[PDB]
Every structure is written in C-alpha cells, then in structure tokens.
Design a protein around this ligand. Sequence first.
Ligand SMILES: [Mg+2]
Lengths: 50, 84, 402, 50, 51, 1340
Amino acid sequence: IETPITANFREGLNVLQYFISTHGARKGLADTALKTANSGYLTRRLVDVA
Amino acid sequence: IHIVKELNVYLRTARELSHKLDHEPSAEEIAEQLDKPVDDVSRMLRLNERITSVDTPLGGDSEKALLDILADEKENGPEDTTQD
Amino acid sequence: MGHIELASPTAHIWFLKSLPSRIGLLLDMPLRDIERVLYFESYVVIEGGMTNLERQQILTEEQYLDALEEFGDEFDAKMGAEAIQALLKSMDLEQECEQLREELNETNSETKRKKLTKRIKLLEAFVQSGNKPEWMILTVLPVLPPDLRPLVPLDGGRFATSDLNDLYRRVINRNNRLKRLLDLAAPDIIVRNEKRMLQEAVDALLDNGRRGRAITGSNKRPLKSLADMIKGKQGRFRQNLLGKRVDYSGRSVITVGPYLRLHQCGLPKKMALELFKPFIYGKLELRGLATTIKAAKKMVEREEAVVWDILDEVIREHPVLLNRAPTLHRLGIQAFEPVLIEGKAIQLHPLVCAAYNADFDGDQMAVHVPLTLEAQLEARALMMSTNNILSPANGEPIIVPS
Amino acid sequence: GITKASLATESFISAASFQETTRVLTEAAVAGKRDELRGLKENVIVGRLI
Amino acid sequence: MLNTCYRILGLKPTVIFADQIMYTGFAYAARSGASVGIDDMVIPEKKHEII
Amino acid sequence: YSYTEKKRIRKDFGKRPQVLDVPYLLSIQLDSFQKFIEQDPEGQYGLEAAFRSVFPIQSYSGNSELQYVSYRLGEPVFDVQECQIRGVTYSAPLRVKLRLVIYEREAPEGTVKDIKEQEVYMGEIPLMTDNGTFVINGTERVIVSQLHRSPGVFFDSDKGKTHSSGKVLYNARIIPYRGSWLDFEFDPKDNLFVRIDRRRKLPATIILRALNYTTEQILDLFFEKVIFEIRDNKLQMELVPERLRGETASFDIEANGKVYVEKGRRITARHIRQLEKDDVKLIEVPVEYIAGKVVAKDYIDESTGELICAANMELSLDLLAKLSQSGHKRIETLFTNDLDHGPYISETLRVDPTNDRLSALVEIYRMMRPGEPPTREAAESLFENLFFSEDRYDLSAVGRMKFNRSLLREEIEGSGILSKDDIIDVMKKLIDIRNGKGEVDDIDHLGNRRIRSVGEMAENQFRVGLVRVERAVKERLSLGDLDTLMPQDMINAKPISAAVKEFFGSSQLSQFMDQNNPLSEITHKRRISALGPGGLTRERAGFEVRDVHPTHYGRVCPIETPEGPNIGLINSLSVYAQTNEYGFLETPYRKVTDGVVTDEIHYLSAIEEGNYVIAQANSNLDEEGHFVEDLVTCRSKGESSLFSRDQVDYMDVSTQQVVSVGASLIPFLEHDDANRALMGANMQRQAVPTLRADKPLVGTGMERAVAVDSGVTAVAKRGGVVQYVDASRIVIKVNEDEMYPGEAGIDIYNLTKYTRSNQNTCINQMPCVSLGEPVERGDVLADGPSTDLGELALGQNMRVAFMPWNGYNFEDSILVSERVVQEDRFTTIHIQELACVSRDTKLGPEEITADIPNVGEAALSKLDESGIVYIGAEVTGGDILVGKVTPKGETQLTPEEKLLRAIFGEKASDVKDSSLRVPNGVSGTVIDVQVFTRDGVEKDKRALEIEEMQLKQAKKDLSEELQILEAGLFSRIRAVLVAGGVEAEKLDKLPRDRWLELGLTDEEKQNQLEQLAEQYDELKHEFEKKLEAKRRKITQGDDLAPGVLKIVKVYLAVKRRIQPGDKMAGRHGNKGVISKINPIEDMPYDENGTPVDIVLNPLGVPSRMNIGQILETHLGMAAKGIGDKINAMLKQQQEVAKLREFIQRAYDLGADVRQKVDLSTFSDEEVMRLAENLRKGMPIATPVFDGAKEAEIKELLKLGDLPTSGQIRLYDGRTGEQFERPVTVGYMYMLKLNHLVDDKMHARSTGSYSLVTQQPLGGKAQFGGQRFGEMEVWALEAYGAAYTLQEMLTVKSDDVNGRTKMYKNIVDGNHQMEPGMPESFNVLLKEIRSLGINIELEDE
DNA sequence: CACGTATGCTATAATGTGTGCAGTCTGACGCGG
DNA sequence: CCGCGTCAGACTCGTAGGATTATAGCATACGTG
RNA sequence: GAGU
Ligand SMILES: [Mg+2]
C-alpha cells in the first residue's frame, strides 16, 4: 500500500490505521490456513519419490 | 404387498386425522380411529422406518462416515480371545 | 464372492473411459465411435468379407439398410457390446503387430512413431500378460462379499446399509428384466433400451460419476461406488493401509516440565494405568496377587494401592513415544522414560519443544507404547530424545535453549 | 519430474497408492505386471517388516 | 557452545550440560525480575520530525 | 442515571459524544422473521408473497382451479419451555382458506358452476423466540443470515484467459432470482456470443433474431452510420470531425478550397478542431476508399426488383458502380473503427448461421434440447418460457432494481420478466466496456453483495413446498371429479412440512446455537455467511472474496472471522450496521451542512457511500460549530486523504462503528495487533461461565448493552416496586402512571433455574434486586449466567505479574496460585444429559427394572424400586443410573463351559444387561430425572412419583398466580371505591369475597368497577382452562420413535475445578495452559504482603504485539488501587461526606471526560450502596478507539498512590529476598475457556475394532485409538524403527490372530512379536476383484 | 384349513421427458479435429 | 495450435445426532404345520 | 471450534 502505517502500537493506532493494518494481517493468516496444503503436498511428493 | 397396502391405509388415515387435529397423529390416535390394536399400528410404523447409508459422512462435513464409528461387537478384543 | 450372469455383455468402464482408452487404443477405434456402437446409435462392420466394405467402419441405421439388399450376407456388421466384444475376439494380435512394425519402417514421423510404438507395446504386453481382449467385455459380473457391504441394524430397529447394495440392486433388477424381455421375445427397441439400462447400472456400480451423471441418493449426494472406496483420500490405500488406527495409544494436552531431565516426560497416572493394562495383569499373576485375568481386571478397576506399586514397577525403564502433529520430520516423534504424575496433562521437556514446534497454547500430543523387546530397544537406541540432538536436515543442534 | 518418476518405478503398488489409482490399475492389469515388493511403501501396505 | 561441546566431549557430556544449562537459565531468568512496562518501549525524539 | 446505574457507575474515558446509541443487537433476526409471518395485504411479504406467487393455480384441463384466500397461524400446542423439555419443535399450525372454483366448458367462462371454500391445514411452521432462536427437537438453533451475489447484471472478464495471448474477454451475466442464466461473452476474434445456463455457445445475434429483429434493424441498434452521396461522378461522404482521431489519413483530405491533411499523415486534435470550427459536413473522396466499408441496409434495383447488395456486405468498386447505375445516389455504410467503435455485431452477423426469426428459435431450441426434432410450437414455447414467462422467471424487485441502476435507468422497480430493451441494453453496455468506456464490477464490492436473512430464506423453501404440492394438485384436478372431490382431499401437508423441516434442520445456515456464554449467542446471531446453498464452497473459495474490502468499513468487521478454512466466508456484522430494505448493508453517518455537523443521521448503502466525502470520527468538532482544524481526514471513492472543512459532506457517527460487537468489547484494541485481536475476540466467545459472576474491571461500555440485549438476563417490563423476591421468581408491582387500568398490574417473572446448555454448561438466573425496591422500566431484575448487575461478566479479573518463573510459564504456559482454586472462582458447573432407552426387539421388550444379573447391594442402594437412581444421589464412573435389561436369545457354549456349567450348575439366565451407567471418570450429582412412556405401556412407579410432583406443584404455581392476581385486583377496586364513598377500614371489615356487589354513583368510575369485575370472572374461568391444559399435558403419553417403548433422561451436575492442562486466556489473544498450581507460600508477593494470583511470561508480548494486555494491566492496577482506598475508608467508617469528596474527584479525572457524574444529586444511602460495590475495584470503561490514553492512566495511578511505571517491587516467596528489579503488576481480566483437560484426556489399550477395515475405531466417545497416519509412519521409516512400525501396522491394528497372540505373550512376559497380514489388505484385493481385475498373490 | 407370500384384473378417452439442482476454481498435461 | 477433459490439491484433533414420499381394492394361488 |  502507498500509505504505510506511520504510527505504532504504544501510541495506539486510529480507526483508519487499524483498518489499513487488517488487510495485510488477514492475508497472512489466510495464507497459513490455505497454503500449507500445497507445502505439505510437496513434502508428500518428495517423500514418495525418495 | 399386503403389508405395504396395510401401511398405506394407516397413512391415508393419519393424513385425515392430521388435517382435523391440526397436528400429526400419534400411534394410538390412529389406532383409535381404525378401532385396532396399538401394537399393530406401531409395528407397521416401525417397518416404514427407512434406511441410512453407512457411507454417508456425518455432520455436514465430508470428514467421516457411520462406518468410521461403528464397531464389530461380535469380535471381542485380544483380551477376550486371550481369556479363552 | 458370488457372481451374476449378465444376459447381455457389458463393457468394463475402467478399460473404456479411463484414458488412454485401452479398448479404443487396441482397436485403433476412436472413443466416440465405440460409444455410438455401444449405445446403439449405429452399426460397426466386424467382417466385411467383400473388401468393398472394410473392418471397423461405422454405419448409421440407414447406411445398414442400403448394403443389406446389395451386398448383405457376405458382410457382418452388428451393434452394441456384443459387436465390440466380437471385434475384439477376432483380432489377431501377432499378425497386426508385425503389419504395424512393417509400417513403422516406411516413414516414421515423430508422433506417429510414438503412437505406433504405443500400440506395439500394448500388443506385445498383451501377449506377454496372457490377457485376452474378450475380457475387456464382461459376461460374468463378480459380487463382493456381504461383510464388505454390510447390512447392520442400529439400536433403534433402524437398518444401515452400504451404497453398493443399492447399486447392485439396480443391476440385478435390470438384468433379470432383460432375461424376461428376451423370454417374451420383445421388439428390438425395448431390448435396446434394457441393454443400455444394464450397462448404465454396471458403470454406476464400478465407477459412478465417471461416465456421466452419478446416480444419486435421496440426499442429492452421489452414491459411493467400488472405485470410490479405492480412490482418493477416503480410499483404502491412503486411509486404511498407509496409515492406521492403533492400540496402546493415547492423547492429551501438554504442559511444561521444567524440572524434567532431557530423557523424561510427565505421564498422568490414569493414562498410564490404561496404556499398560496387560503388563499389569501379567505382573499381578507373577506376584500371585491375582488368581486369574478376570480378578486382575476387577483389581485394576478398583484401583487398589498395590496396583500403583506394581504399575511403578513396570514403567521403570520402559520408553513411551510422544508425537505432535503435523509430524514434519522424524523428531516429531521422540522416546522418553515416563515419570508418573498425578494430574491429567502430559508434561514435556522444554528443550525438545523446538523439534516438535510445541508451544503450550493448548497443544496436544499423542502417546504410544512400544510393546515388544525389539520396539522398546528401537525406541531407547534410535528414537530417544537424548540420542537425537542434531537436525538431520542441517548439522545443527535442535535442542537449543530458547 | 517427481510425480512421473514415482509413477515410473517398477512397483505398481507404490504407484497406485500414490495417486491416479484408476489409471495405474488399468495399466498394471493389462500388462500383467507383478510386484516383488522391494520398496518400503509396498511392505508397509502388506504389514511386513521394512 | 553446545556444538563445540558435542564435537570435543561427546554425547553424554552434552546431554548433561544441556539439562544443567536449562536449569540455571530459567533460575536466573526468574531472579532477574524482568518484565514489560510501557516505559521500556522508548520512543525516538526525532520521531515526529522524521515523519 | 438509572436506578441500576446508581448501584454501580462505570467510569468513562471516552471523549466523543455518542450521537447515536447502539441498536437492538438481534434486530436483524427479529425484523426479518416478523416480516415473514407478517400478513401484508397488498405488498406481499414472506408467506403472503409465497401464496400470491403460486396461487391462484388452475388444472391442466383449465376447467377446475384453486384460489388462495387467507391464512392463519394456530397458537403453538406446546410452549417453548415444554418443547425444550420434551424434545419437540416449537411451531404454529398453518391453516389456509382456499376456494375451489370450477368453469363450465359449454359456457364461455361460466364461473358460477361449483365453488367450494374451506380451511385446510398444511404444515406447522417453526416459530422464532423472543431472542431470535428457533426450538427444533428441543434444542435452540440459530439461522445465520447469508451473503450472496445480488440478482441483476454484472460485467466481468477473465483477466487473460488464454495465457499465451493474454487477451481480455469481457462478459455480461444476467442473474435472476429464479430462472435460467443469460450470459453474453466475447471470444478472441471479438465476436459476441450468447449462452444459456452455460450451455454451448451461440452467436449473439441469434437471440435478437428470436426477438424478431431483421439484419437491418440489428445494425441500426448497435451501429452508427456513414453516409455516402454519389454526386455527378465523384464520390462524396458525410463527415463527423471526431471520428478521424488517432488514425492515419489514407487519402488527401480536402474540402471546398483548403487542403487540410495529406496522404499518410497523423490526425491530431488540432486538425479535428479546425474541421469542426469550419463546419465541414460533406467531403469529396476517392472511390477506392469504399473497399472495406460494410453496407448497412438492403438496396434493390427499382427497375428489376432484385437484390443488388444485401445488408452487412463488404462494398467494392463493382457493387458501387452497379448501385449508382440502378439509381441509388446515397449509401448507408457501417461508422466503424478499430479503436473506438468496434465492429463486433457486424462480424457476429457473418458468423450467425441463422436467417430469420424462426430459424433463430430452432437453433436456440436445438442447443438446449439437442437431437430432438424441433417443432415451431416447442421452439416458441421454450424461448418464451425461458426468460419471458411469469412462472419460471423472476428477477425480483431486487434484481430489477440492481439491473436498472447498473444500466443507468431512472425507474427502480418494474417487470420481473426481461423486455427486449433490457437485453439489448446489456449487450450495449458490454460492448461499451469493450470499446474502453465503462468498467467491470467486482464482485467483492458490497454494492454487488446482498444479505439474505431468515425470513426470506423460509419464504423461499415455503414457495418450494407449494410448488411440489401444486404438481400433485394439477394432476388430481385433471382426472378428478368436480363434485365429490374436496379441496383438502387433494392437498398434502407433507411436501410443504418436509421442505420446511429440511431447511430448519438440514441447512448449513441453521445450526445449534452457540450458548456457552451470552456473548457467544449474541454474536452468533449477528453472523453472516457466504457458505451454504446458493453460495461459495470452501474448496471453491478464492482469496479475493475473503480478504478485507474497503466497503466493509462500518458494515462488516475486518477483525472477526474464524482462522480456519472459513476465514473469509464467515463474518460478524459491524455494530451500527443494518439491513437495507432491498438487502444491502448500510452504515449511519452524520450529515454535515456547510461545515456545520447536524445531528440528523443518514444510513448510506455501499453504492451511495462512494459518492460523498466522509470525514472520520476522530476529527475535532468546534463545540457545535464545525471542524476545528482546516485540514480534515476524510474518505471517498474508497480512498483516504485530506480535505477542507466545507468540502466535507458527512462524518462517521461513532468510533465503534468500524468493528463488530465482539471486537468492541476489547479494551485498548487500538494498541493490539489485528491478528491477536482476531483470536482474542474469537476466544472471548469460548469463555465458560464460572460459579461467581465477576464483573470486568477494565471494560469498554458495551458490556451492559450485550448482556441486556441478549435476553438471557431478566429485565423489567414496567417500572414499580418489587412485591416479592425469591430464588425461583420475582413479583414486581407496577406504578400507577404506567399501570394499565384493566388488570391488577402486578408483573410475575419466574426465573429459569439450573438448566443444561448445548455445550453442557450450566444456565441459571440469579435475582439481582432486594425485596421492596423501587425499580425502573428496562432495568435488570435478574442476572443471566455470565452477567453481573446488568453488565457482561465472562471471566474474572485478577492480580497478575509479568515475569519468568523457572520455565513454568514457558511458551504461554501459566503459573497460577492455589488461592484461585481454593476460592473456587474459576470453578465451573457442568450439567450433562444421560439417557436410557427401552426398545422393543424381535425377542421381546426391554424392561427398566432394578433386577439385573450380578449387581451388588451397594449399587442397588441408590436405585429405587423402579430401577432409577434417586434425586440428589452422588455418582461416580461405573455406577448404574437407570437399570435396563434385554431379552437374550441361543448361544453355543464351548464344551468347556458345558462341563463347567454341569459342575457348578449355574445355568445361565433369560435376561441380559444394557443398563445406563456413569461414563468413566465423570462423577457428579443427579439433579433431575425425566420419564417418557408411550400411551399404553404400564408406567413405572418412579414415573408416577414424578407426575405427583408435577401435578401438585403445577397446582401451587397456578394457585399463587390467581391469589396474587386476585389480591392486586381487589387492591385497585378498594381504591376506586374510595374515590366517591371513602370508608377505608370500614369496608375491609367484612370478607373480600363479598365485595363486587358494592357500586358507586353513575359515573365513569362505576364503569371502571365493571371492567375489574368482568376481568376478575374472566381470570376465574381462565384459571380453570389453564389447569385443564396443564393436567392433560402431564397425563399426556408421549409419542416416541417407533420401537422405543420408554425413555429415561437423567441430568447430572458436575463441579469442575481448574487444573493443569486447562486453557485460559485474556481478551488480547493471549492464550495459555495451566502448567502448575503453586502453593501460595511460593508465589511472588509485594512489600505489603499481597501475593500475586497469576504469573504470566513476559516473553509472550513483544513477539505477539498485543500490548492491550499491558495497558489493561496498568489500568487494572489503578482501578484496584482506587478500590482499596474505598475499601480502607469503608472499614474505618469515616463518613458520607469524606467518601463523596474522594469519589467526585475520582470520577471527574480525565482530560476531556465526556460523562459528568455529580454526586450532589445522589442521596447519602445511594452513595453507600455505590461505594459498597466500588470497593472491590472501581470499574472503568475504555471505548474502542476512543480509549484512555497513557497520560490518563498514569494520573489514575497517582490517585491510587501507585507508581507511574505500574511496576512494583516483588519478593520471591521461596527465598524471601526481593527480585532484582520491579515487575509490572496489576489486574488482568481473564477467562477459562471451554477446553477442559478432562474432555481432552483419553487413553486406550484394547477395545472395539472397526467393521470392515478391522482397525480400531476413532474418537474418545467411542473409546477409539489415535491415528498413526502417513506422516507419522514416515517418521518411523526415516528413523529405521522397523519393529515398532510393523507393530503399529499389524498387531496393534488389523492383524487379528496377531493381536490376540501378542496380548497373551505380553501377559506372559515374553514380548514376542508374532506378526501376520492386515485384514484391510485382504479387503482391498477382494474389492479389486469385485471390480473385475484379477489381482493374485503368487506365493514363493 | 389356515397363514404368509404372490400373482392378477379392473373396459369413457387419455398417445415424446423437462424440474431441480449446478455453480462456474486452478495450473498442467494429453488427445481429436 | 485450440479446446475440452482429467487429474491432483498437508497432518492430527473435536461436537452432535438426524430427515422424504407412496404405491387401489379384491379374488385367486402357492407352501407349511 | 483446537494447535499447526
Ligand atoms: Mg501451538
């Protein structure tokens, strides 16, 4: 995102900084749930061939 | 065929009862209408109990079926076999 | 096992739909072409003695009427599974192999050489296997044993059955109706519909949602066919054969044991009491405390004070395996000497939390009992936490303070 | 590649158990193939000693 | 440290040493009394200016 | 402030005046379902809509027809309470008046033939409770609203479909509410196609031919025109200046007498404007230019009358010459351009294989019904029945509305059927988008995503039931007799009842209400789901839809959704958000006129929001003037920046409106990372109610609203004074001013005691009032399970210190003091439900007797004569609760048992043992038992005793009702008699039973006496009928499942105390598991001697970035410091004055405290009750983003005489010496989550095995083993542990003889491995052979 | 003979299906025109 | 080549049980105690 | 719904 978060946690983010943070956070968390399938499937293919 | 047709008369009668009672009828209410034994009505309704697939996965989730839970009760464990 | 005598032959869908065609590849017949023949849209020439009409050349309904008067007799062209089976029976693999090899020498283009080498290897392997092409077509249909498609009563007088039984019921009904329609000498349009019907039900039985619409239950969901039990994750291999449910296994929540030494873990008494049940009974009989197995059982149910001392005796020097999911590398399973504790959670040593990626925010672990002297030795020698420090991936210590 | 290499091993039990099981079994049935059980997969499937 | 000990001394010593290190580590961690207050999170005076 | 607030006021640190209060939180649920049942006369809604949509229907023949009149819901035969206990669904019978009308065939439309009108029953519809649940089979269930793509039009394009080319192919999709889908799309050759229900592809012009459009007309619709006049000899063209743009001039462009552009020269802006200013219309041009222009219309030779050139034909020198000489000196060709006006339809007509309309209809027909011989009838009928039939197609008002707005029409509502123009306009816009003007929508924009609540979904399934019955009706009407056949004989209730039961039952959106916590219920009912039918699937879900969309601002919480695969789909509604009338989301904003911020509020939809510039709530207002600062932070078009003050159109109402309910409860959310906050909010829902409802010190303010709105607390309907408090009930007498002149005016609330929740927790209501207290309307009378004096109390605050401790708080692990356990504050109640079913088998009926083979006297002591355990009885695993016995059939006794039973005699009896016993390791107290018997089977002695209780207790309850109602009613008549003929104690002398004969003078007060006299007799007869009903229902023999003779349900109550392995957390996403319960002697303690309750690891803060917990702790400590000062002052008993001085100063601390709380209005006693509560710790409210700032918190600590750092010197309880440095100490509000180790602990040696596979079963409830899966196997393979592996594959799993042999060996010491072959493998082979593949074992 | 299970015939004319969902995933690898 | 099709898509744990419809009305026929 |  072009506007980064200038503020920090001790100071406290405002409504809009918090909202802006959400997107990235959630993207990360969804990546845990969703992408590990594909990581693990790679592991499985490796294992099968070795 | 005899059982099926008997059961059907029990059903049609239940429908008339349900219209006027507002409520779906009990076994004994249907029996009182036919002037017949409650045991007869009950046995017939038991026969109408339709089957469930052992393979159907449980809880709206394609996780595991009935088979996955359902034991062999006749087969005792290594405990029972070793006791014999 | 049992079997069913089919009135009309039927194609094995696996050797039809599952690509490469196999049956189509072997006859050099396009798959669509085979299907038009099977579903009785059009005839196929099995042997046109008159070179005027050659082999495997499709004729529509009206095309069959023209040469009927003209050539007739000296050309045999038929329809359905019968036709294809016959075409298969009469093809001589040896001869056509040599013919195609001769053609391979003329002007072998890259893709042509691959397709021809493919059929060559098919024909070669077919003769080597001792398989016959007739067998692509089923006249006899096998029936799976009862206990592998069980019909069991639930408690309430309900019954539960396998979907296979429903699929088989369709096949039998349709096949037996076909026998009846043949006994009654029925007009050919109705015979055709029943033959198609039979093939549809067989295909559903073997592999449901393969050819077309999977036949569905009242629930909307496609019935589970034979192939579905072998195929995919829910399949036999993945689910019941490369991995298994296992006795002498338990699980609980884990918590820290800072006081523990590296080769130890906190094992709840109640958990260990169950896991080591037979060892306790055996020792009870050596002590002569328990007269019989049944007495020992009732003695452990009552959880007598002597039983605790005996349990303490057995668990000495006996390794248990701790596992945490997902088990990404081998150190996700490690062996420890158990230390019996009052309290329902397993206590894990801090330094090996790294290997497990175990953090105590509610994590759980599985416990396994190595039973045999061999397994116990494998656990203590190969799998013991003390013995396995370094990551097998990089040459670094994985037991690192954190 | 890893997938095809695993499917190319002489063992059809290893191949079938991995993936593509319908195709693997048609191939093996027609070829009349025999597995003499060299690999670990194969042994574990039959519950034998690694 | 642990690596060096493994290479020179061997397995037995390293295992004992690792346990020992764990005990003393936690022991001193607690004694230190180390905690997290809002004043530790020091800010830079040049914060508003840079921004 | 209210009377309940006088008891305990929360201190507010908020600064922003809340112009709007939080709405009723379960608004959505209730409004929706209310609309569904609400009978609307014209504008059909819910039920009414379904009837009018289907009805009136006529028969296949057309002579007989059924018409709908009106419906009515019967009152529910069993009320909620009874339904929960019995396990029945709470529903109302649906009776519908219908009129069977028949027409004569000989007369034209002889409507006066036969008209039969009557009321028919057809299904009971489940009713919604007061708090938005449904009671289905005795369990509370919530239907969660769904979110789907709005019916209408939508333009999209697969961004580089063919990856090699990467060309963007645009498509239009018309999505109706009911009907076939209609898709328009481009191909790589830029030809427009049409598809129906994604079938095969057809040229787009084919559909226009279906609508009867000739080629000429089609071109006139989509294209413009280029006219060519042929004068004298030279060719002239009619010119529009702004066509020739971005092009290369092919010939020498000149006009009258000035040459502008040369051959091969680029035509820029300047040239165009020159030409336009000069007023150029006609230009001489070369003949060779025409080659390539397509002629628009047809041209015929007037002489011959034959076609010279057909339309859409590329012109050439020959054609042109021929046309000139026939006598046509003007030629319409297609305006067309590579860049701007693309010739798509032109090229598509060339691909169109159809000619005329009929041909087009046939091809359409042949797509969807391939092979089948087309008939003209069938083609016409098909096409009309696709998108032009009222029956099968309906956009709905929402579809039409969304469609019309997307096409930039003026009229919102209109035809649900597609008109000709509608289609064309969709094609036009698609083409526009292709040219470059316009853009595609997304789907993720909330302007395109609509919310579908319960009422609309029930409406839909009800329409379906109607349609199924309609089929049956039509079929029976056709063949049916006109005279003998009654309407109700044709109707079946079952299809409708089935469809509806299936929705509230089978549907994913309908689920067991999550009720382990008031918050859990309230947020659950405020949920939105993108899953289920007509929505996404987990597999099918991408990343785009899941992630946070700019439109979510104020509508959906960005910080509330499960971390599972349901991450993007399931979502909680934002606080202030509401359902638009058409189903979109909308958020309140305060209108700003000329800088001045009015108190008028406007709810903006997603689409409307993008149009206006909206200032943030954090802008500083200039005391009812305007924005203080000249630059203001605002947003529009989904993007945020600085604006001037007068530019601002609107502003955010509340600082809370961005977040959901759950997230709002988190104080200092502003200082927490969003990840952690997500987990914190999710975990807060799992907080299990403790024994002692403790309020949270460091709250937010939302606590009160949640508790009250959830409906789990009992609140007062009408203000007045409490006449009788009790543990079981509360009777409040209403004030004269609110008290209606009809009834006595005494409200009675029976409180729901110890009841089982769905999560097996305990639901009990406690009274929170004193006897004889004056209470205001809408105050809390009784607290629910996790509420305290009206506020939400999910957990318990306690004294925490942040420091390491010997690794006992290692990775989030928690070291807690024994003190917490001793005080039993985290201890929890669990009410579990055990049932014993007595079924009828083929051999004979199972009996519930105490007479069971092999039972000890110890066991039978607790069982009564019937075989049922007594109420109150303490049980432990293995004890029998309900004795049950089953008839055993023959069993082949091994020769050994023949010999043995001959020796001992002990001939084995006919009855077995299926008794229900206590599950192993659970132990508790039997608190209630319920018995269900069928109507005919002889009742148990115990069942009779329970019915005795119920009958006599019911009589007492109803008798107290009429007694206190009679007493309150005569107390009124006593007062009315005084107004006129006052004789106070002289009237009370003779008995009250002889009172109503006394009247008054002929006035309106004499009529008031008549009203109380009529109601008193009404209540008398009503009491008779109520008691008859009660008695019937108690006698009523229950209709159970077929086969089941009788059922016994036992409710155990267990006291679960906290222990190592249990799970605890705060509201900042800080989890932990209890590792060790340390003796209080060992706990770190401060100088004063006060020991800490919990020691949390500080190493779980910086990595986590949840700093809210630190702030919470500091504010928590200050809150408690003030509490201890108040507590000290109360123990000393200084005086009211002194307490008042301190407390006033305290409330008015903050820099810009919004709420002012003057203690001068409070009377001295009110101050005493307040201080009594505040002593435990002064409760403080930190709103979400409008919270307490660091300065304010430190100021509060100074009033507590606590350090500014909030760190204190602590002493090691083991050594007695101090820790080297100060540690942060204070109160954090923590929760015990549902995850008890008790439920988690499991172990198995040997037990049942699976049916086919023969391997052990799964799950702790079935006594199952853990799975050693592929992952787990690989571990062992790697290590090379071969025997252990084989062990787990064989003796531990399938190998049958191996497992038994191994067990015997283990009992005999020798740990010998005797392995074989797993049975599952055998099965596999057999399954392959059943496939018809010969797979054989070749032995060695 | 009875009890349980089955096969059977009924006489205005009526003569080509539809229906209930499916919702469209993704990067890759082969296979007829 | 293009287009249509088929094939795969991490590992353990959990919770809870459960739902739909309708087949006429009567006379003769076959098998077991 | 729980750790990954
Ligand atoms: Mg973890």
